[model samples]
Target: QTQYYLKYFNPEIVYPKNARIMLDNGDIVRSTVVNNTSNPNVDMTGWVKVSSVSQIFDETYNITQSVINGNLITVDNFGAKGDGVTDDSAAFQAYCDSALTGQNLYLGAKGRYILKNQVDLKGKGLVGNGCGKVSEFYYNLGCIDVDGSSPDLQGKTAFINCGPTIQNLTARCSNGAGKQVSFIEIDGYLANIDHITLINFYNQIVVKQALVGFNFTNAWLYYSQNAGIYCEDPLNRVSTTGTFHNIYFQLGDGHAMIFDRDVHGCDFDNIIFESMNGGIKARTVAHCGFGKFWCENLKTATSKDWLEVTGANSCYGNSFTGYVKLLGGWTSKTSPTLDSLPTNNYGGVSVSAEGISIVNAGNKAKMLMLPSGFKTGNATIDETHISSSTVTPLVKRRVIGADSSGAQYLASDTYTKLSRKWGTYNHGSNNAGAFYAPMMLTYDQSFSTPQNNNGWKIVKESTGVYRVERVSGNTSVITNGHIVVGSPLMGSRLGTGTGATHGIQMIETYAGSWTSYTEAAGFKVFWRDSSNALVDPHRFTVAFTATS
Candidate 1:
């Protein structure tokens, strides 16, 4: 059997922009840049480019690496455990205390690893060992537990309170039935620590007053009972500020996210509530002052209401149409109150207001059925005045007008008179405006003049109503003749009966004046004849108008 030996290397004196050649003696060192001596004190290892420190471990050992750079030193084949479950935490921490400073501890790739009790990160800047990108690494089954109630991890031992930037890291809690351990508990006496980003964690994440800022994004919070993330304090101190977006919760029995009496100024957006019994909740006895609650694109697959805002606060621009019940309160109604009104009147189905102004345009409604107490400040209605009986009820409330070209008909009565010179009579065609006969009378005879001896005579009568009439004729003829009152009365020749043909002829009126009418419910009008019968039952035109 042939055996090919593979050796691990570490750098002794690394340079900038050059590869650290691996040595057979397990030592990795760097190459120098040619002729570049500007900054002799600056270590050239700063320019050594490793696209991803985690990928090198993936190609070397089958197990992934955790915590790569910074003050903590990592060895690929320390004790040659080969599997990620080996106890390398003490060795790695010892190397960091001796040789490394101002560096990060990196985990190379995906595997289950054991953290015996705790790993104290007390350096200036500590980072995870993977690609440093958010998606490529997984830290599973790693835990840190202190014996007493001390912080699991301390940043500076003598400085008493210093929390550094711990980014892109995850810690899994022990899976005993009732162990009741938190992922991380920070208890340093620090003010102004760095922000902690806990990505892709699957247990209860808790933080006390020791940590300052937190950011959780694109993470799945699963199977924890108390809360996915909880921040609270007892001394009435201000807790950390954080933001949560694109997070999903599943099968969890506690609040998805919570803030206790002292946690304030937290924001949440783009969060999904899935199968979690309780959504985000806050119970603060003290006044949590002046914070914004913004939620968008939150969906729930199960029958859970998305949020509950219990205290006396104002909310704006939130839509709650998905869940069965929304926006409950002490009043115990399922619907929200608008402007303190409780009924579905005055356009309450869509909009609510005390007053509305519709100005400078024609307003129309097909069938407006307004209930009682619905008052219009000012309004108008108009209709065609076809006859006296068909007058609009609220007369002179709106302007009305029409034409009357076809309003004449003949009566069935007649009479006549002889050509006995009655007087120096005014017997021309009653051409000037005059009533030839009463509406109850008819016509029969024509008039005659003295030259050929035709004179105006009496005529017929009829049983019809009176209407205004007018005539047209030549004004220059024999000065006078006998008067008449019926049709078919003859007239002797005055001057070539051409001028005698100019007898009085009558015509009916065709136009009326403009007037106003008022508006009312079911308002209408119709045109009718003198007996008050509708003339054309289908041709009634109703009109209306309004102002201010």
Candidate 2:
């Protein structure tokens, strides 16, 4: 008798090679085939043929099932058929509808799936993986037909409700002969939509109706012959309090992304707007308003102006379209009682309390402004008053003396030595190499070598009338410049000993004509006591004169 292996055939075994298999559970599995030569039938009466093949047991068995028939051991459903395009769209959609109702849906791997109409998710999340892959999906067929008439999914229609999220899903409209279609069409009465993350997908989404209270993050708009992403409804009011990060808009016409009216509170970060005709347009209607608009590293060709804020309280970061104008509220044409237009930094333009704009030539600009009545730290001048008209010059200073004799007298005794002390002697020991010209004046001091204490020596001196000097050749004995001739304990106290002092008077007199110390030629001094020593008969003084 020929014993046959009996096992249920896996429906997925029919998948074609290299074809994408989108599972009903939103898993995209790729189909692979392996050729093996084994007789289908064999006869065995008693023993079972079971061998632990490494390839079959390690990788393939985890994802497949095995069966035994007498002497034959067969692998069942090794080749599965689940081409994402052929037999997965319907099943995947059914699974998505079942698993995710008004919630974000995630699809992994790469596969081409077609969607006939908008998945009227009244405010749900949609997600997908394989971001850069060319997996296509279509929505809103009426717009594709370009029938010059609104389709069934037009007019106050919302595919996603407010407060729902759509993430990781790529939807591509079919390139049929129909009119230009919109991937998404949201309308009024769909408020309360917040925190929707559309990550790593290409969408030519359009919302003709107004979008009120919506939020998005990590979404992308790309590859549309018509418009990339449009929000151009006058009647619908849209407010966005959500955060957008790592969102990208690339390759499209008719405004890569536009916000007509009723758009507010939409903040964007790490967003790239590249390779588009009109990079981004924010066209506000007569009564519409705009909120914070931000962008970073937005690169485009033809020097396109990315934003057009035609409403009150709207500002942009260093726009190429010239100065931003406030259209309503306290402008000359608007309410007469309004003194100043209420403007804000929508694209991170810095602003003053008076709402004067500050442009950032750098890519990083301030998008939001401090609230009304906010106080900054003490400013030297009112930054609000500064504008394009302010002019400040960089200047250097020089000094000259008119009274030669008086200046000579002043320089000889006071200014020369004072300048020398200020310039050379008052610097730190580490700055020895920085002193280019050593001072001509020198000093010699002698101190009693203690039984166990270290000695001291002079290092350098200033070449001036009242020569400034420094002495640091000591390990324990502190070398300071000040000393009293009569007072023995006069030098800066060393090691908290009241008895340790300087008992010598050293001076270096000037013999040449003095020169003036320029503003740039001054030295900085930093001094601090060491070891908190106190003395009763101590006297230390450093005196210097100015130079001509």
Query: Against the hidden reference, what TM-scores do the models get?
Result: 0.36, 0.36
lDDT, candidate 1, equals 0.34
Error of 2 at 384 (Å): 11
Q: For each candidate in turn, give its C-alpha RMSD to the true structure in angstroms.
A: 22.9, 23.1
lDDT of 2: 0.35
lDDT of 1 by residue, 163-237 (tens): 334444443433322444445443423322122323222335555552235555555555555567665655646
CA lDDT, every model vs. true structure? 0.34, 0.35
**Cα-based lDDT at residue 222, candidate 1:** 54
Give the runs in model 2 whose Cα sits over 4 Å from its true position: 1-102, 106-110, 133-163, 176-178, 185-203, 207-214, 233-238, 284-303, 312-348, 351-548
